[PDB]
């Protein structure tokens, strides 16, 4: 996105800094080197937020180019992102796959679990290498949410934000959903989106089993 309306806003910058999504790993992939700003004294690589925004806009243009919203598939094998891809598919009408991605989903045409999408979006290339390689048998262009040390073997629209922080993953997924909705005739580009970014955040079970009762005690008293 080269336009002035298609620019990162201060609210977006604040979300990005609060959720993290710029503190990469200590390892740098040579094909991810073009997204890094600088390496800290901690060894943590600092990812350029503008390059991340540009790649996210490129991914949004790739996604909205498909007439059937069901033809794009979102996969998160790791738990930190399954809720994000579920909410993303619910908002955008995509087809989600969470948890164990069974082999032969895109290639073995016999089982009913077989499906052939027109776009692949991946939370993490290391966690989701199995849908990555299978996408190479069916002519499937791929988007992935790649970190500084993510391999880029079968990735096409690699977004350099993060894959480790749950807050960062929820934020990047919510941001992608908001962008692909604003590109289509869904959001009016003026008021902020009514969907809170916390909705996409993965929560560890010891929060689910204590937060609801803490909130119940606060409400009842």
């Amino acid at each position: 996105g080269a336009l002035d309306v298609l620019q990162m806003k201060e609210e977006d910058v604040l979300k990005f800094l609060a959720a993290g999504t710029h503190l990469g790993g200590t390892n740098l992939d040579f094909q991810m080197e073009q997204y890094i700003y600088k390496r800290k004294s901690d060894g943590i690589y600092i990812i350029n937020l503008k390059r991340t925004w540009e790649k996210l806009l490129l991914a949004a243009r790739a996604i909205v180019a498909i007439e059937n919203p069901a033809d794009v598939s979102v996969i998160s094998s790791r738990n930190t992102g399954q809720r994000a891809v579920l909410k993303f598919a619910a908002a955008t009408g995509a087809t989600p796959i969470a948890g164990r991605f069974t082999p032969g989903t895109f290639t073995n045409q016999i089982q009913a679990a077989f499906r052939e999408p027109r776009l692949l979006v991946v939370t993490d290339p290391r966690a989701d290498h199995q849908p990555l390689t299978e996408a190479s048998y069916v002519n499937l262009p791929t988007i992935a949410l790649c970190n500084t040390d993510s391999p880029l073997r079968y990735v096409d629209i690699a977004i350099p934000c993060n894959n480790k922080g749950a807050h960062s993953v929820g934020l990047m997924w919510w941001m992608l959903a908001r962008e692909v909705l604003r590109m289509r005739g869904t959001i009016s580009r003026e008021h902020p989106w009514e969907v809170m970014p916390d909705l996409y955040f993965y929560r560890d079970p010891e929060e689910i089993e204590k937060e609801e009762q803490a909130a119940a005690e606060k409400a009842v008293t």
């Binding site: 080269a2 390059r51 540009e54 002519n139 262009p141 990735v155």
Partner: protein, 83 residues
């Protein structure tokens, strides 16, 4: 194709990779052809027409697919020059 008489004697013309300028084979299932939907200048909304990029299987197996897509989008104007 295109013998002396002029007609194109070849039953198809294959696509060439938009990065490596390589012929995408008939059985090269690793190849892709994605569409990047450009928006209008004023509201940033999809306007129906788009632009198309094709990558051969060799490039997007050695890993250089993302760089090629970014370069083509930069050249065509999708990505701003200040990237």
């Amino acid at each position: 194709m295109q013998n002396d008489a002029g007609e194109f004697v070849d039953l198809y013309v294959p696509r060439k990779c938009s990065a490596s300028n390589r012929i995408i084979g008939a059985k090269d299932h690793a190849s892709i052809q994605m569409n990047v939907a450009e928006v209008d200048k004023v509201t940033g909304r999809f306007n129906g027409q788009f632009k198309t990029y094709a990558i051969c299987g060799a490039i997007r197996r050695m890993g250089e697919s993302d760089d090629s897509i970014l370069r083509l989008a930069k050249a065509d104007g999708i990505v701003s020059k200040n990237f």
